[PDB]
Amino acid sequence: MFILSKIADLVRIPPDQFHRDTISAITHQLNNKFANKIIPNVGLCITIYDLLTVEEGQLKPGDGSSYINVTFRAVVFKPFLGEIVTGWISKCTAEGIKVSLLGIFDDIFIPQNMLFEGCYYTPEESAWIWPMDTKLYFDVNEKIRFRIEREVFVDVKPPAYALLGSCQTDGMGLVSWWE
């Protein structure tokens, strides 16, 4: 579910920090720009795993801050196509179920064209029901096992990164259903 991403970028270290561990300082500036922030067309960046290469700091004629080109890797949240992810039903809208990785990622949506053949919505109880002969209820706040289907990006509701999920195979759905 998690991966590393080789990235390159320019950092700006202030004179107020030239006395700090230069590299620890760099890492700071990266988390500053990426920690828990989205990387366009990639995914959710959690933090810097490590630095790989650093150049010499070129100063600007207007402010004593040196600029530095850095090549690094970063721990990114980017589930793959097909993966089986586990989360919690956060909301049952009339068009699908919204999942969450509790504090990690909230943009997981499982639409009706992804549920089991027959699943319908109930605006009275506020949940999605599953038939098979005998009504099973995907209810709010219950752990959900779902298969990731589409990885949706958007240059920037709407969110720069979201994911579509499913529940169409034995085992997927509310977890209490198959343990």
Partner: protein
């Protein structure tokens, strides 16, 4: 900013759990050190760092 390779390697669930755990230490963000205590300021990094851990340990 340029992406050299979005998928450079899979970080196993454990490896993440570790890295993020050892990370909260350097910055004093652990149950123990949080109660015995300025730690690293970063609210967002500290923020998500905890959540990822609370996830993989459940």
């Amino acid at each position: 900013m340029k992406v050299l390779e979005e998928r450079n390697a899979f970080l196993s669930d454990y490896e993440v759990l570790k890295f993020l755990t050892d990370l909260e230490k350097k910055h004093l963000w652990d149950q123990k050190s949080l109660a015995a205590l300025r730690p690293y300021n970063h609210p967002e990094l500290q923020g998500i760092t905890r959540n990822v851990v609370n996830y993989l340990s459940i």
